[PDB]
Design a protein around this ligand. Structure first.
Ligand code: AKG
Ligand code: ORN
Ligand code: CL
Ligand code: NI
Length: 253
């Protein structure tokens, strides 16, 4: 309670210091909207101490709740999901910093400032998820998100991109679960590829940016936290969660 109250104060001061440079914010909003992506590199998104607390929490959650999954997702053209993961109810049961950060007003206002929108909590069992890629073949195939505003926290990552785990993106698409047309979006757009290191945290426009994680080529450790927010002006009533159900499940396993 008191640690979280102090943490929110440190977050507000951190985000206010970034927002003070409006001319730089214009470029950040530009890049995020144009590319559907913006990376806060080298422990810059949060105060470094708080970020390292998140890294330790993710490691502890994997040590406690890790579940191996090797499935295909019919709503994303049957692309593969081969990973260890921890779902939202498991993170909600043992986590402390991650559930609090998801509800952080200063964090939501800062991301909303970049995105040009108001952030709100998404469907509960998708609010935060963890994935771990380790073995050759582990991947997070081509997909979209059901909700627009996703933050990916790089907990562990190989420094050599040849080992795998590269993120590739096609922005300004959208998700047709019955007719995804993934290859047509790839043919009609250039693909931008990104490599990430431990401490990176990147903002992703997940509902209109087709993306995937290049499969692992050699035994390594790639761990990410996914915090996902809806739009406060989302007027959708019939959002299906078939991808979350098959990869992470909705109950503590
Ligand atoms: O591992 C990444 O960098 C992205 C993972 C992802 O796309 C997701 O969690 O929805
Ligand atoms: N926030 C999690 C997004 C998962 C995505 N719909 C997928 O099929 O992997
Ligand atoms: Cl996504
Ligand atoms: Ni994704």
């Amino acid at each position: 309670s008191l640690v979280i109250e102090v943490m929110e104060q440190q977050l507000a001061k951190h985000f206010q210091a970034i927002l003070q440079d409006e001319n730089r914010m214009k470029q950040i909003r530009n890049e995020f909207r144009r590319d559907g992506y913006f990376n806060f590199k080298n422990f810059s998104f949060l105060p470094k101490r708080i970020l390292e607390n998140v890294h330790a929490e993710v490691h502890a959650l994997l040590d406690e709740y890790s579940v191996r999954r090797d499935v295909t997702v019919p709503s994303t053209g049957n692309t593969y999901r081969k990973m260890y993961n921890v779902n939202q109810p498991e993170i909600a049961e043992g986590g402390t910093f991650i559930p609090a950060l998801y509800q952080s007003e200063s964090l939501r206002k800062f991301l909303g400032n970049i995105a040009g929108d108001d952030l709100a909590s998404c469907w509960e069992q998708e609010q935060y998820l963890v994935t771990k890629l380790s073995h050759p073949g582990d991947t997070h195939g081509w997909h979209w998100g059901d909700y627009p505003y996703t933050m990916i926290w790089i907990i562990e990552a190989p420094e050599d991109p040849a080992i795998g785990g590269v993120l590739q993106c096609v922005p300004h698409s959208e998700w047709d679960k019955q007719n995804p047309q993934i290859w047509q979006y790839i043919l009609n757009n250039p693909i931008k590829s990104y490599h990430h290191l431990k401490g990176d945290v990147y903002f992703l426009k997940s509902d209109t940016t087709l993306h995937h994680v290049v499969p692992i080529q050699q035994e390594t450790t790639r761990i990410i936290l996914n915090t996902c927010w809806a739009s406060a002006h989302d007027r959708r009533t019939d959002v299906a969660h078939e991808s979350i159900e098959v990869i992470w499940d909705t109950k503590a396993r």
